[PDB]
RNA sequence: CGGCGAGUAGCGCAGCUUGGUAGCGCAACUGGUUUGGGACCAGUGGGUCGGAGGUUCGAAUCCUCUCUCGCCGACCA
RNA sequence: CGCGGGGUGGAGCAGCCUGGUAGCUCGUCGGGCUCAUAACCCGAAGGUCGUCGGUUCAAAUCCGGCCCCCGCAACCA
RNA sequence: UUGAGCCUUGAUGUGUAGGAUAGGUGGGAGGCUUUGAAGUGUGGACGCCAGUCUGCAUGGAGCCGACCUUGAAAUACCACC
RNA sequence: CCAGGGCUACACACGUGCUACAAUGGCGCAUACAAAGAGAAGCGACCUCGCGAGAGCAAGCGGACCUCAUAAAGUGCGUCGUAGUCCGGAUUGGAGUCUGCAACUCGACUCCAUGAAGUCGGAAUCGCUAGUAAUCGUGGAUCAGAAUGCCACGGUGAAUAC
C-alpha cells in the first residue's frame, strides 16, 4: 500500500508489514491493528480498500517516518549545540550512555582502521 | 588410552521400534542433549522416506547405510622415517558408526527447509547412492586405493 | 506528434482517500487509486508540526509541579 | 663539451615503446609459533612516477626544458 | 615469390596419421598429513583449441582459405 | 633381402537403430544345384578379440529375394573401384 | 581533615567471557517435571493501582510450616519459509521506576522508538573419558544499589578411545 508514506511489503502479516514504517515496532503495530479492528493474521494483499484507509488515520496518531527523523536529529542537534556532555560525545563520535571505550565501542567508532 | 581397554556402553533400544542401530543414529543427530528434538526429526524423516522408498522404516534405513558404509580408510602411521598413509580395514562396529556420521553431516550441509526434509533427502538419494554422503565414501576409497601399496 | 512511437496516453480516473475523484490522462493503464492528493495533503497543518519546537522550561514545570 | 640513457614505495628492479587503473622482491607493520630471538606461517599498509611547461577530453607514458647520475669521444698536424 | 611444420586453462606438453570416448605437468585454492615448514596422496576451480567458410547420422582433430611466429632453401625494375 | 609402381585369382572400414567385420549407388528383386546340399569338426588366419571367412574332409542333391526393426542396401549374382 | 574530580580516559594490541549469525530455530498461546540456598534496621504473600520496571496496603516468618519462588530447556497447537529476513540485538532518541544525602562525569531496570556489525570465522589454539562434554534454568556470598564474574545446585544428556 502506501501507509504513512512508504509501506510496500506484501506476503506478510499486517503486524510485521506495518513495522516497515520508521516509528512503529511490534507493540505499536499491535496497537494500530487493534484500534483499526483488523485481525493481525491477514496479508496486505487480502486487505480491502475499506481497511487500508482506516489504518492511515490510525497510523497518523503517532509520529512516524517523516516528522520523526527531523525530531530525533533536532534533539541530537539540541545536545550538540548545547555543549553538554552527551552533546560532546555526539560530536567526537563515541558512546554517550556511559560505557567503556578502552577496548570496545566499535559501533560508535566504526572499524579499527589503523 | 595407554592402559585401559574398556568395554563399550549400554544403549537402550529405540522406543518407536526396538533397534540399537537406530538408537545410535539419534545420538549422532542429537545436539545439546536434546534427544526428544532429535527423535522428532528421525521419525518424521523415516516415515516420509518409507513412503518414497516403499519399504518399511528400518529396512528402508539400513539399505541406505551400505552405500555410505566404508570398508577401508587411511591412517597416518610412522614406522621408518617420515610418515605416510596406510589403508586399514574398518572394524564392523565402527564401520556403520562412521557411516551414520557422514550422513548427518551431509544432511546438515543440505540447503533444504527442515532437518526432517534434509535428512530424508540425504538418506533417500544415498539409497540410489548419488548424494554427497556416498561421495565421502567414494573419496575415502580413492585415497585408500591410491595408497594400496602399503599393507 | 509522430505516430506509433509514443506510449498509450489514455484518459484514466484517479480517486483519492479524501474524496477528490479526478479525471486525468495518463499511461497508468486505467483506474489509479490514490491515498493522498492536493486537497488531501497536510500542507496547511502538517508542515507546522516540528515548527512547533516545544519548550524546555515548561517540562521543568511539568516536573516541579509547584 | 655532444650523444645516449637512465631517474618509479625505505632499497633494488619492471611498466613507458604502442596514452585512461603502476607492479616486483626485500624491508616495514599486525597477529601467530617458541622460554625468548631468528627462521617460518598468515595478514596488511605504503608511491602516485626527479622537477617544470606544453600537447590531449585525459600524460608514469607523447614532446620540450632545465636538474641529477651513468656511458661513449672531445681527433689529425 | 614456394615446400611441408608449430599456434591447445595463468604457464608448458600429449593424443593429429587409424575421425566421435579435450587428458597431464606446475602454479593457484580445499582436504588429509606434521612439534612446524618442505615434500607427499585425494578432490576441485580455471580453456570448447589464432580467426573465417565445408560436409556428415555426431567434430575441439580432417578439407581449404586468412593471420602471426617460423625453420630453411629461393630472389637481376 | 627388399620397397615402390604395376598385372590378377583374392581381399576391406559393427556409432546407433538393433540379426547383420556391409565403400558409395543400384542394376535388378532372385541367384542357387545332383560335371554330388543346410547345418558342422578344426588347422589356422584376422581381431575395437566384436565377430566373419575359407582348405584334407565329415556331413554329403538342397540352401534361400527385398520380409524383421533399418538412416542403407544384403561378396544369394553384381559393375567399377 | 574536607569538598570536587579520578580509579570508568581511548588512534590501538592482547587475555578471559557473554550474546549471536538462526528452522535441531524465532514468535504467540496452553501446559508438565527440580535440587540447593537465603531471610529481621531482613524476606515480603494476598489484595489494589500501573503496559511495565514498580507503588500502596500489608499478613506471615528467625523459619521442613512464611516469603523470595511462576524453574527453564521440554511438550502440544498455530505462524514464519531461508530472507540480513518475525534472525541478531548493539547503538541512539524520548518517557519512566527504584536505591541512595546525591545517578553530570559514572548505577541497575522498565516502556516506546531505533534496529548496526554479523550468514559459522586466516595462521593458529583450548577444554573434555560419563551423568562427563554440550545445553537449560535456579540459588548464594560481597552488597543501600550495582555482575555476562565467582562459588554452588539440579534438568535434559551424547560422541569416541584401534
XYZ file of C-alpha atoms (C1' of nucleotides) in Angstrom:
728
model
C 0.000 0.000 0.000
C 1.242 3.469 0.914
C 0.721 3.550 4.686
C 2.159 6.781 6.167
C 4.361 7.485 3.175
C 6.011 4.274 2.028
C 4.737 0.749 3.031
C 5.135 -1.582 0.150
C 5.674 -5.002 1.668
C 3.470 -7.898 0.671
C 3.004 -11.566 1.654
C 3.480 -10.545 5.307
C 1.037 -10.370 8.143
C -0.057 -6.872 8.982
C 1.702 -6.689 12.354
C 5.006 -7.316 10.628
C 4.191 -5.387 7.468
C 3.353 -2.262 9.458
C 6.794 -2.265 11.072
C 8.395 -1.072 7.831
C 7.469 2.481 8.833
C 10.174 4.314 10.760
C 8.336 4.821 14.007
C 6.489 1.597 14.715
C 7.647 -1.733 16.082
C 5.848 -4.875 17.130
C 3.893 -3.368 20.012
C 2.907 -0.095 18.370
C 1.697 -2.029 15.325
C -0.440 -4.226 17.560
C -1.943 -1.039 18.978
C -2.700 0.131 15.443
C -4.462 -3.003 14.268
C -6.402 -3.383 17.498
C -7.705 0.176 17.166
C -8.445 -0.438 13.485
C -10.382 -3.645 14.120
C -8.117 -5.632 11.788
C -7.006 -9.162 12.575
C -3.248 -9.486 12.789
C -3.033 -12.624 10.625
C -4.076 -11.013 7.341
C -1.795 -10.189 4.463
C -1.743 -6.792 2.809
C -2.814 -8.351 -0.495
C -6.071 -9.573 1.066
C -6.753 -6.150 2.575
C -9.724 -4.329 1.133
C -9.520 -0.615 0.408
C -12.045 -0.182 3.216
C -9.318 -1.429 5.558
C -6.248 0.391 4.223
C -7.860 3.783 4.829
C -8.695 3.091 8.474
C -5.021 2.307 9.047
C -3.808 5.582 7.529
C -5.631 7.764 10.025
C -4.746 5.216 12.696
C -1.025 5.424 11.971
C -1.345 9.221 11.757
C -1.788 9.418 15.547
C 1.871 8.507 16.163
C 4.904 10.459 14.973
C 6.253 8.368 12.095
C 8.693 8.279 9.128
C 8.675 11.881 8.016
C 8.479 14.102 11.055
C 10.141 11.595 13.372
C 13.586 11.814 11.769
C 13.688 15.587 11.990
C 12.525 15.326 15.588
C 15.323 12.947 16.578
C 18.002 14.818 14.640
C 16.995 18.131 16.169
C 17.231 16.666 19.683
C 20.744 15.473 18.887
C 21.444 18.928 17.485
C 19.886 20.335 20.632
C 22.534 18.475 22.611
C 25.444 19.105 20.255
C 24.878 22.861 20.216
C 24.285 22.848 23.966
C 27.870 21.833 24.625
C 26.717 19.361 27.263
C 28.408 16.057 27.966
C 26.174 13.923 25.759
C 26.401 16.503 23.005
C 30.168 16.499 23.312
C 30.362 12.756 22.820
C 27.963 13.037 19.910
C 30.434 15.405 18.236
C 33.567 13.292 18.535
C 31.634 10.105 17.963
C 31.921 7.903 20.998
C 29.344 6.174 23.223
C 27.181 8.575 25.156
C 25.415 6.348 27.680
C 28.459 5.977 29.910
C 30.070 2.760 28.768
C 33.648 1.718 28.253
C 35.966 2.862 25.490
C 39.266 1.202 26.334
C 38.611 -1.905 24.256
C 35.077 -1.791 22.868
C 32.635 0.698 21.309
C 33.198 -0.416 17.752
C 29.626 0.612 16.935
C 30.195 4.290 17.638
C 33.794 4.276 16.428
C 33.416 2.207 13.272
C 36.067 -0.302 12.245
C 39.596 -0.311 13.653
C 41.238 1.087 10.554
C 44.860 1.683 11.535
C 44.459 -44.900 26.028
C 47.677 -46.316 27.440
C 46.368 -48.890 29.821
C 42.635 -49.499 29.764
C 40.885 -51.487 27.076
C 37.408 -50.502 28.226
C 34.230 -52.280 27.188
C 31.580 -50.223 25.434
C 28.320 -48.743 26.668
C 24.745 -49.979 27.107
C 22.474 -48.124 24.708
C 18.776 -48.617 25.287
C 16.820 -49.515 22.124
C 14.721 -47.116 20.096
C 11.236 -46.523 21.561
C 9.307 -46.487 18.271
C 10.698 -49.836 17.157
C 13.430 -51.518 19.174
C 16.738 -51.092 17.382
C 20.054 -50.043 18.866
C 21.411 -49.116 15.443
C 18.675 -46.550 15.014
C 19.168 -45.625 18.661
C 22.823 -44.936 17.960
C 21.743 -42.861 14.960
C 19.628 -40.475 17.008
C 22.602 -39.780 19.269
C 24.733 -38.647 16.331
C 21.874 -36.409 15.223
C 21.432 -35.018 18.733
C 22.805 -31.665 19.788
C 22.931 -30.012 23.225
C 21.496 -33.090 24.885
C 18.092 -32.507 23.277
C 17.144 -36.080 22.482
C 13.395 -35.525 22.088
C 14.134 -32.917 19.436
C 16.353 -35.365 17.564
C 13.886 -38.241 17.841
C 11.262 -35.944 16.336
C 13.481 -35.462 13.296
C 14.349 -39.147 12.856
C 10.806 -40.498 12.972
C 9.407 -37.752 10.756
C 12.188 -38.356 8.247
C 11.968 -42.136 8.368
C 8.241 -42.133 7.693
C 8.473 -39.672 4.812
C 11.245 -41.766 3.318
C 9.371 -45.055 3.845
C 6.587 -43.618 1.706
C 9.056 -42.667 -1.026
C 11.042 -45.895 -0.720
C 8.051 -48.189 -0.363
C 9.958 -50.346 2.099
C 9.128 -50.004 5.762
C 11.247 -47.960 8.159
C 14.294 -49.932 9.283
C 14.921 -51.863 6.058
C 14.488 -48.646 4.134
C 17.026 -47.142 6.504
C 19.671 -49.851 6.594
C 19.858 -50.221 2.811
C 20.944 -46.592 2.709
C 23.783 -47.469 5.058
C 25.782 -49.781 2.778
C 26.155 -47.075 0.167
C 27.863 -44.898 2.786
C 29.323 -47.677 4.920
C 33.024 -47.804 4.031
C 35.345 -50.765 4.280
C 38.892 -49.330 4.261
C 40.222 -45.988 5.431
C 43.570 -44.289 5.730
C 45.589 -43.836 8.896
C 48.845 -41.956 9.261
C 51.390 -44.337 10.748
C 55.138 -43.871 11.115
C 57.445 -46.860 11.342
C 60.632 -45.920 9.484
C 61.384 -42.293 8.673
C 58.710 -39.860 7.529
C 55.052 -40.785 7.948
C 52.600 -41.865 5.249
C 49.000 -43.095 4.997
C 48.265 -46.807 5.337
C 44.811 -48.142 4.405
C 43.397 -50.219 7.221
C 40.281 -52.326 7.342
C 37.500 -50.729 9.368
C 36.245 -52.868 12.242
C 32.497 -53.554 11.867
C 31.199 -51.728 14.952
C 32.983 -48.577 13.778
C 32.076 -49.269 10.170
C 28.396 -48.374 10.348
C 29.079 -45.863 13.120
C 31.307 -43.931 10.747
C 28.582 -44.195 8.121
C 25.968 -42.588 10.362
C 28.265 -39.632 10.995
C 28.790 -38.974 7.285
C 25.046 -38.863 6.687
C 24.141 -36.347 9.371
C 26.947 -34.020 8.362
C 25.857 -34.303 4.753
C 22.281 -33.536 5.723
C 23.408 -30.535 7.747
C 25.023 -29.040 4.649
C 21.840 -29.583 2.646
C 20.084 -26.406 1.575
C 16.523 -27.625 2.095
C 13.919 -26.288 4.511
C 13.811 -28.528 7.582
C 16.131 -31.145 9.032
C 13.455 -33.789 8.501
C 13.279 -32.916 4.809
C 17.074 -32.554 4.628
C 17.876 -35.897 6.201
C 15.180 -37.742 4.271
C 16.574 -36.326 1.040
C 20.088 -37.379 2.024
C 19.027 -40.803 3.218
C 16.985 -41.425 0.058
C 19.477 -40.338 -2.580
C 22.087 -42.403 -0.775
C 19.824 -45.384 -1.376
C 20.309 -44.500 -5.037
C 23.910 -43.533 -3.982
C 24.007 -40.098 -5.601
C 24.350 -37.842 -2.557
C 27.441 -36.204 -1.185
C 27.404 -38.732 1.652
C 28.387 -41.506 -0.726
C 30.898 -39.130 -2.299
C 32.628 -39.073 1.070
C 32.708 -42.866 0.887
C 33.955 -42.819 -2.687
C 36.714 -40.362 -1.857
C 37.899 -42.315 1.143
C 38.127 -45.342 -1.150
C 40.068 -43.416 -3.758
C 42.866 -42.339 -1.462
C 42.856 -45.768 0.145
C 43.242 -47.399 -3.256
C 45.799 -44.783 -4.196
C 47.703 -45.979 -1.135
C 47.138 -49.712 -1.641
C 50.947 -50.048 -1.836
C 51.117 -50.055 1.992
C 49.928 -53.177 3.816
C 3.185 14.190 -32.703
C 4.770 11.314 -34.561
C 2.629 8.231 -34.714
C 3.310 4.790 -33.210
C 6.371 5.782 -31.157
C 4.660 7.154 -28.080
C 3.129 5.297 -25.121
C -0.592 4.697 -24.833
C -1.764 8.052 -23.485
C -5.335 7.396 -22.412
C -7.780 9.001 -20.020
C -7.990 7.409 -16.566
C -9.819 8.168 -13.330
C -7.984 8.915 -10.086
C -9.734 8.597 -6.717
C -8.019 9.728 -3.537
C -8.971 8.880 0.023
C -10.104 12.415 0.844
C -12.864 12.166 -1.737
C -11.260 14.125 -4.544
C -12.045 11.999 -7.585
C -10.381 13.471 -10.646
C -10.227 12.712 -14.345
C -6.781 12.871 -15.937
C -4.963 11.456 -18.942
C -2.048 9.182 -18.155
C -0.249 5.985 -19.112
C -1.040 4.093 -15.901
C -3.394 1.853 -17.864
C -6.639 2.618 -16.032
C -8.154 3.393 -12.622
C -5.431 4.831 -10.454
C -6.463 4.648 -6.792
C -4.698 7.197 -4.620
C -4.202 7.783 -0.921
C -3.377 11.495 -0.842
C -3.891 14.366 -3.268
C -3.617 18.141 -3.396
C -6.657 18.783 -1.181
C -5.731 15.769 0.958
C -2.102 16.562 1.801
C -1.326 18.205 5.160
C 0.466 21.162 3.638
C -1.631 23.502 5.819
C -1.232 21.781 9.208
C 1.353 19.024 8.799
C 4.094 21.378 7.654
C 3.900 23.226 11.003
C 4.464 20.258 13.331
C 8.192 20.404 14.088
C 7.993 24.164 13.544
C 6.347 23.914 16.948
C 9.649 23.030 18.606
C 8.275 22.847 22.151
C 9.639 24.356 25.334
C 12.154 23.157 27.887
C 11.260 25.175 30.976
C 7.621 24.068 30.854
C 8.868 20.487 31.023
C 10.503 21.558 34.283
C 7.152 22.918 35.425
C 5.628 19.586 34.403
C 8.085 18.005 36.857
C 8.360 20.575 39.639
C 4.524 20.882 39.555
C 4.718 23.672 42.144
C 81.654 19.739 -24.397
C 77.968 16.439 -27.889
C 75.088 11.766 -27.955
C 72.587 8.334 -25.499
C 70.273 6.719 -21.323
C 68.625 6.472 -17.010
C 65.536 8.922 -12.755
C 59.125 4.769 -10.468
C 57.116 2.706 -2.324
C 62.603 2.634 2.553
C 66.213 -0.224 -1.163
C 66.996 -2.816 -5.831
C 64.248 -3.703 -10.271
C 59.607 -3.864 -14.139
C 55.506 -0.893 -16.685
C 56.859 3.760 -20.929
C 57.556 1.540 -26.757
C 52.022 1.152 -28.736
C 48.154 7.330 -23.768
C 42.929 6.110 -19.451
C 43.589 1.700 -13.491
C 51.814 1.483 -11.643
C 53.810 -3.543 -10.179
C 58.063 -6.857 -8.176
C 61.224 -8.632 -4.391
C 63.235 -7.217 0.133
C 62.193 -4.206 4.130
C 58.227 -2.249 7.288
C 53.743 -3.091 10.322
C 49.944 -6.530 12.936
C 48.921 -11.438 14.597
C 50.701 -16.464 15.273
C 54.573 -20.282 16.534
C 58.812 -20.528 20.872
C 61.005 -19.738 27.424
C 62.664 -15.720 24.142
C 65.200 -14.121 19.464
C 65.961 -15.702 14.406
C 63.759 -18.538 10.763
C 58.949 -19.825 9.153
C 53.429 -19.111 8.742
C 49.439 -15.956 7.990
C 47.643 -10.862 7.345
C 48.147 -5.641 5.936
C 49.946 -0.866 4.744
C 52.770 2.490 1.864
C 54.184 5.514 -4.029
C 51.196 8.241 -7.235
C 56.362 8.387 -11.299
C 63.365 13.919 -10.433
C 61.381 18.786 -11.484
C 58.941 22.385 -14.912
C 55.914 23.555 -19.127
C 53.244 22.127 -23.273
C 50.068 18.662 -26.498
C 45.462 15.922 -25.423
C 38.881 15.133 -23.209
C 42.782 12.709 -20.322
C 50.310 12.117 -19.573
C 54.262 7.360 -15.415
C 53.914 7.085 -20.838
C 53.866 11.738 -26.093
C 57.114 16.460 -26.864
C 60.268 20.363 -24.846
C 63.091 22.490 -20.897
C 66.472 22.524 -17.175
C 68.249 19.016 -12.778
C 70.847 14.579 -11.115
C 73.767 10.250 -12.319
C 75.788 6.999 -15.805
C 78.233 5.567 -20.750
C 80.778 6.926 -25.296
C 84.781 10.573 -27.503
C 86.424 15.680 -27.244
C 90.747 13.526 -33.033
C 94.973 14.837 -37.432
C 99.247 18.125 -37.745
C 57.893 -15.268 -54.756
C 57.096 -21.752 -52.573
C 57.751 -26.540 -49.697
C 55.967 -29.070 -45.797
C 55.726 -27.595 -39.706
C 54.277 -25.320 -34.996
C 49.656 -21.922 -32.627
C 45.844 -26.015 -27.196
C 43.115 -23.336 -18.710
C 47.685 -18.312 -15.657
C 52.016 -21.010 -17.611
C 54.155 -25.768 -20.565
C 53.130 -30.676 -23.019
C 50.475 -35.380 -25.436
C 46.644 -37.618 -28.063
C 46.776 -35.091 -35.286
C 48.158 -40.083 -39.047
C 43.933 -45.139 -37.926
C 37.761 -39.260 -37.386
C 33.253 -39.483 -32.182
C 35.085 -41.590 -25.763
C 39.948 -32.499 -24.542
C 43.699 -35.513 -20.953
C 48.614 -34.027 -17.908
C 52.787 -31.215 -15.626
C 53.347 -26.975 -12.421
C 51.279 -22.588 -10.163
C 46.632 -21.276 -7.571
C 42.527 -22.920 -3.746
C 40.157 -27.147 -0.477
C 41.249 -31.682 2.425
C 44.365 -35.479 4.745
C 49.384 -35.234 6.896
C 53.433 -32.898 10.888
C 56.006 -30.434 17.027
C 56.134 -26.767 12.373
C 57.917 -25.927 7.333
C 59.005 -28.623 2.993
C 57.584 -32.975 0.492
C 53.662 -36.264 -0.445
C 48.429 -38.650 -1.623
C 42.720 -37.359 -2.752
C 39.286 -33.870 -4.829
C 38.181 -29.212 -7.225
C 38.217 -24.095 -9.924
C 40.025 -22.195 -14.484
C 40.287 -23.193 -21.542
C 35.267 -25.642 -26.162
C 41.684 -25.166 -29.029
C 44.725 -17.800 -33.529
C 40.342 -16.405 -36.910
C 36.658 -17.257 -41.419
C 33.727 -20.988 -44.812
C 32.739 -27.043 -45.877
C 30.496 -31.837 -45.466
C 28.304 -35.934 -42.438
C 23.732 -39.593 -38.512
C 27.953 -36.611 -34.488
C 33.943 -32.809 -34.939
C 37.664 -29.340 -30.459
C 41.161 -33.344 -34.857
C 40.144 -33.720 -41.473
C 39.106 -30.042 -46.189
C 40.775 -25.449 -47.934
C 41.322 -20.134 -47.172
C 43.115 -15.864 -43.698
C 46.711 -14.052 -39.581
C 51.198 -14.406 -36.624
C 55.759 -16.958 -35.464
C 58.874 -19.858 -38.112
C 62.941 -23.435 -39.911
C 65.034 -23.099 -44.359
C 66.306 -23.182 -49.393
C 64.949 -19.130 -53.373
C 65.032 -13.829 -55.291
C 68.560 -9.015 -61.673
C 62.540 -2.912 -62.161
C 66.771 -59.249 -48.688
C 63.570 -55.797 -50.392
C 60.430 -51.373 -51.215
C 57.891 -48.782 -54.992
C 54.755 -48.913 -59.293
C 52.161 -52.478 -61.966
C 49.042 -57.448 -63.968
C 45.208 -60.549 -61.380
C 42.626 -65.068 -58.576
C 41.580 -62.922 -53.775
C 40.799 -59.272 -50.260
C 38.369 -54.068 -46.990
C 36.180 -49.917 -42.950
C 29.840 -53.367 -36.174
C 28.145 -45.046 -33.842
C 23.138 -46.334 -33.494
C 18.641 -48.391 -34.547
C 19.191 -53.010 -33.121
C 20.045 -60.403 -36.677
C 23.754 -58.143 -39.844
C 33.815 -57.134 -39.824
C 28.429 -54.080 -45.497
C 32.686 -48.212 -49.531
C 29.177 -45.222 -52.380
C 24.501 -46.112 -55.540
C 21.837 -49.536 -57.823
C 21.164 -52.897 -61.871
C 17.568 -55.669 -60.847
C 14.209 -58.143 -56.791
C 16.264 -63.943 -57.051
C 20.874 -66.051 -57.523
C 21.492 -71.445 -56.435
C 22.326 -77.058 -57.545
C 22.969 -83.600 -58.373
C 30.498 -82.095 -64.181
C 27.054 -84.856 -55.746
C 23.255 -79.537 -50.204
C 21.788 -76.547 -44.944
C 23.705 -77.448 -40.544
C 29.462 -78.831 -38.804
C 34.799 -80.836 -36.743
C 39.215 -77.883 -36.953
C 44.233 -76.394 -38.930
C 44.575 -71.579 -38.662
C 44.266 -66.519 -40.105
C 42.181 -61.966 -38.547
C 40.600 -59.182 -34.271
C 37.505 -52.060 -31.196
C 39.058 -60.335 -29.570
C 33.004 -57.527 -31.712
C 32.849 -61.379 -34.908
C 33.113 -63.292 -40.342
C 35.875 -66.333 -43.670
C 37.860 -70.234 -46.253
C 41.079 -75.565 -47.094
C 42.214 -82.876 -46.466
C 37.037 -83.761 -45.389
C 32.917 -85.437 -42.249
C 28.067 -84.221 -43.388
C 27.137 -85.286 -48.347
C 21.279 -83.090 -54.313
C 19.468 -78.550 -51.096
C 20.390 -73.760 -49.159
C 17.394 -69.308 -49.707
C 14.821 -62.333 -52.726
C 13.829 -57.296 -50.667
C 10.185 -59.993 -45.335
C 12.243 -58.487 -39.481
C 13.036 -53.449 -36.809
C 16.952 -50.226 -40.826
C 19.419 -43.579 -41.719
C 21.247 -48.182 -46.073
C 21.135 -51.969 -49.322
C 22.170 -57.685 -48.304
C 30.651 -60.930 -51.836
C 22.397 -65.046 -52.841
C 24.953 -62.751 -58.935
C 26.597 -57.799 -59.423
C 29.701 -53.301 -62.204
C 33.766 -50.073 -61.486
C 36.898 -49.413 -57.681
C 40.562 16.696 57.819
C 37.300 18.262 53.752
C 34.886 19.145 49.055
C 35.008 18.112 43.967
C 37.483 15.019 40.440
C 39.900 10.412 39.148
C 40.452 4.801 39.689
C 35.285 4.112 34.247
C 40.143 8.243 29.611
C 40.931 5.895 24.078
C 44.484 6.336 17.484
C 45.355 0.859 19.127
C 47.235 -4.575 20.675
C 46.225 -8.926 23.825
C 43.657 -12.268 27.546
C 39.105 -14.367 29.676
C 33.952 -14.327 28.813
C 28.720 -13.261 27.168
C 25.300 -12.962 23.037
C 24.814 -14.108 18.122
C 24.920 -15.352 12.898
C 19.019 -18.974 13.033
C 14.201 -23.631 11.056
C 17.590 -29.237 15.918
C 15.115 -22.064 15.173
C 12.013 -17.369 16.234
C 7.363 -15.644 17.991
C 2.223 -16.377 20.075
C -0.958 -19.405 23.331
C -1.590 -23.570 26.535
C 0.901 -26.897 29.890
C 4.496 -30.749 32.901
C 8.722 -32.230 35.959
C 13.677 -29.957 40.081
C 17.549 -29.569 43.503
C 20.173 -26.422 46.587
C 20.117 -21.933 49.400
C 18.883 -17.237 51.767
C 15.698 -14.167 55.147
C 14.580 -9.275 60.865
C 17.478 -1.762 60.727
C 15.588 -8.712 56.651
C 12.493 -11.878 53.220
C 7.949 -9.819 51.857
C 2.278 -13.103 50.499
C -2.668 -11.880 49.257
C -5.326 -7.576 47.515
C -5.493 -2.916 44.821
C -3.106 0.529 41.138
C 0.349 0.821 36.869
C 1.519 -1.650 29.731
C 5.899 -2.404 32.661
C 10.079 -1.619 35.940
C 7.164 -0.879 40.371
C 3.808 1.610 44.129
C 0.168 1.478 48.106
C -1.955 -1.542 51.789
C 0.182 -5.116 54.428
C -0.450 -10.854 56.771
C 3.370 -14.484 57.791
C 8.435 -15.837 59.016
C 14.459 -16.015 62.893
C 11.801 -20.398 59.614
C 10.920 -28.990 56.837
C 5.292 -24.944 58.193
C 6.249 -17.926 55.961
C 8.317 -15.313 51.894
C 11.898 -14.830 47.922
C 9.545 -18.610 44.035
C 5.761 -18.769 38.063
C 12.303 -23.412 37.200
C 13.815 -23.222 32.045
C 15.101 -26.214 28.185
C 10.509 -29.879 27.413
C 5.734 -30.893 25.381
C 1.070 -29.670 22.403
C -1.122 -26.134 18.800
C -0.637 -22.027 15.426
C 2.504 -18.924 12.490
C 7.079 -17.638 9.950
C 9.545 -20.278 4.959
C 15.570 -19.266 4.140
C 15.499 -13.780 3.738
C 20.399 -9.792 6.744
C 14.795 -11.713 6.918
C 9.102 -12.145 12.559
C 17.314 -13.890 12.580
C 20.566 -10.712 15.762
C 20.464 -7.334 19.486
C 24.332 -3.407 19.529
C 23.817 1.779 19.334
C 20.960 6.145 19.813
C 16.408 9.330 20.947
C 12.281 10.036 24.129
C 9.459 8.796 28.525
C 10.000 6.463 33.448
C 10.859 3.294 38.244
C 13.963 2.079 42.365
C 18.168 2.518 45.625
C 20.762 6.344 47.934
C 22.375 12.907 51.203
C 23.082 12.591 45.870
C 22.756 8.646 39.405
C 26.644 15.106 35.259
C 31.238 12.621 34.888
C 29.652 7.201 36.497
C 24.143 2.670 38.621
C 20.704 -1.055 37.580
C 15.953 -1.716 35.480
C 11.360 -0.693 32.571
C 8.487 1.419 28.351
C 8.153 3.371 23.329
C 11.016 4.216 19.035
C 15.550 2.856 16.575
C 17.384 -1.623 14.601
C 24.268 -1.658 13.317
C 28.086 -5.453 12.898
C 27.330 -10.417 11.999
C 25.270 -15.602 7.032
C 29.969 -20.306 11.447
C 35.151 -17.273 11.435
C 43.022 -16.947 8.499
C 47.607 -18.760 10.584
C 46.901 -20.724 14.919
C 44.778 -22.749 19.585
C 41.765 -24.681 24.086
C 38.684 -27.921 27.146
C 36.669 -32.730 27.897
C 36.500 -40.151 29.060
C 30.000 -40.447 31.661
C 25.806 -38.391 34.403
C 31.326 -36.192 31.598
C 31.310 -32.656 27.257
C 27.297 -29.751 25.489
C 22.887 -27.253 26.819
C 18.930 -25.289 30.175
C 17.451 -22.608 34.290
C 17.851 -21.726 39.869
C 20.453 -20.015 44.342
C 24.316 -17.790 47.248
C 28.294 -14.743 49.056
C 30.085 -9.453 48.534
C 26.145 -5.743 48.667
C 21.924 0.768 50.210
C 22.148 -0.010 44.857
C 25.241 -2.115 41.149
C 27.644 -8.991 37.714
C 27.728 -11.977 31.411
C 32.397 -12.729 37.121
C 32.941 -16.163 41.225
C 31.069 -20.140 44.301
C 27.213 -23.684 44.428
C 22.554 -26.504 42.643
C 19.717 -29.513 39.804
C 17.159 -30.580 34.290
C 17.996 -32.921 29.630
C 22.086 -35.640 28.085
C 25.949 -37.513 23.987
C 30.142 -38.942 20.644
C 34.778 -41.619 20.905
C 39.212 -44.231 22.713
C 42.246 -49.016 17.224
